[PDB]
Amino acid sequence: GNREQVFPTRMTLGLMKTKLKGANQGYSLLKRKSEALTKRFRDITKRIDDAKQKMGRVMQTAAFSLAEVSYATGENIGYQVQESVSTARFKVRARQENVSGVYLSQFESYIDPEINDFRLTGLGRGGQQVQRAKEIYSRAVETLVELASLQTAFIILDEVIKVTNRRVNAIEHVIIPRTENTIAYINSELDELDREEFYRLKKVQEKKQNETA
């Protein structure tokens, strides 16, 4: 079949044998890497669904029930908090976890006090009105960041497994067969050269012995 265009020599034969051995053991290496990443991918796909369910049934129940207005608080403003725009907070820090040998770009909660805004103590309503946004919404955004950590863990891992499986297929279906064909061709050509030299030597020996002896 398809083979590398190289000239048959014993050095090239040994080089191709070494390349084939390296290809086989690298194929096994990438196979193991793919299986590990696939197990972790199963786990991440389960936990991402679980996190999505929990966020879906925590966001509306607690975070979206803000009591800063109107009847539950001393003010009836639906966008009073937006008047206090300032430096962002409740932020995430993308961590570099050793997931399965590769390093992901997952995230972790690293909130900061920001401008220390609030839905009360100046927003008309009292402290009890800001309890929802102050605490339940903070927990909701923390959960959202934790879920985004499983979103980017899933995307990166899916990409990595796709690449690794493509490379395993390339090794076992394109590179290894090509190297084996090259080895077979080199072996056949070297056997042909050996036969030629052997029979030329035999002809010389027979001529000498049976004509000049």
């Binding site: 000239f7 390339a170 394109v174 042909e192 030629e196 030329r200 002809k203």
Partner: protein
């Protein structure tokens, strides 16, 4: 030389029915051809003779101020005949059993080609072009005959069996094939087809870029490829399918005159340039190809123009093709 009797039967049957205009009037090409046949099952030792006969006849006609082409099909059979005679003689074998004097014989035989001034008067100039088919054992160009011939000859039309099995004909391997006469031909082109060498080099560059991109794709797939790379691969496929591939047993592609070849190169390179220009100006290659499939089909079908329709008519329709392609590529990219 050492080839099928049936190949000589079909030449004898067909050449009387094929006509040439070199003299100004239609006349069978058999009127200006000679055949020297030593079939594979004819005496082996005669193969050499046949070759030496052919060239001599060719030289004779070169002495008359004619331009002769002598076709040696195949020289590997002459080498094999020499090998058999050497074996019967008990001589020391060279590479692959051939005699040690094979390369010298081939070089001397090929030195008999050339453009020359005849010996006598009145002054007249002729030429002998040797075109030799080589039949490497196993299809491997490491064959001693192939190795000697490539050392001797100046043009290397190397054929790929993977192309032939696909019915891609001619199956010229564009990666290995070479011509060393491209430099001396510039004069000719500068007088007749001035931008012929530029288009030839553009086509070769496109083909090489596609060959390397295909090595990349085979392992990595057609992803992470710039739209320019996609255009290069697509247009190289177009060239391979509809320019480098010529059905020699059709009414339109049996013969491609140099002017039709030049116009086809112009059309294909114009397609490539228009696509590159359109994509470089923000166009998306997939959508653009979907929109200009008609232009692509016209460029690919350019090969069906009958050369018998005349140079003027075919050139006129090639100009129409070029103008339509420009207009459509302008329309499809705003």
């Amino acid at each position: 030389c050492g080839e099928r009797g049936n190949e000589m039967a079909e030449v004898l049957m067909e050449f009387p029915e094929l006509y040439t205009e070199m003299s100004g009037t239609k006349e069978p090409i058999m009127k200006r051809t000679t055949l020297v046949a030593n079939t594979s099952n004819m005496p082996v030792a005669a193969r050499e003779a046949s070759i030496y006969t052919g060239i001599t006849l060719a030289e004779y006609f070169r002495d008359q101020g004619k331009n002769v082409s002598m076709i040696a099909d195949s020289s590997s059979r002459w080498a094999e005949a020499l090998r058999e005679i050497s074996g019967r003689l008990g001589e020391m074998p060279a590479d692959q059993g051939f005699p040690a004097y094979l390369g010298a014989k081939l070089a001397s035989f090929y030195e008999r080609a050339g453009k020359a001034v005849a010996l006598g008067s009145p002054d007249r100039t002729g030429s002998v072009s040797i075109v030799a088919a080589v039949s490497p054992a196993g299809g491997d160009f490491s064959d001693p005959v192939t190795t000697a011939t490539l050392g001797i000859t100046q043009v290397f039309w190397g054929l790929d069996k993977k192309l032939a099995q696909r019915k891609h004909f001619p199956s010229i391997n564009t990666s290995v094939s070479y011509s060393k006469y491209t430099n001396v031909l510039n004069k000719f082109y500068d007088s007749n087809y001035p931008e012929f060498p530029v288009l030839r080099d553009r086509m070769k560059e496109i083909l090489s870029n596609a060959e390397e991109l295909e090595q990349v794709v085979q392992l990595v797939g057609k992803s992470a490829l710039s739209d320019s790379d996609k255009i290069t691969l697509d247009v190289a496929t177009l060239i391979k399918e509809d320019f480098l591939q010529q059905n020699g047993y059709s009414t339109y592609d049996a013969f491609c005159p140099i002017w039709k070849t030049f116009d086809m190169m112009r059309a294909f390179i114009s397609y490539h340039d228009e696509a590159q220009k359109a994509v470089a100006n923000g166009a998306n290659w997939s959508k653009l190809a979907d929109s200009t499939g008609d232009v692509k089909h016209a460029v690919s079908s350019s090969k069906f123009f009958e050369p018998s329709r005349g140079e003027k008519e075919v050139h006129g329709e090639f100009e129409k093709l070029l103008s339509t392609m420009q207009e459509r590529f302008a329309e499809s990219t705003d």
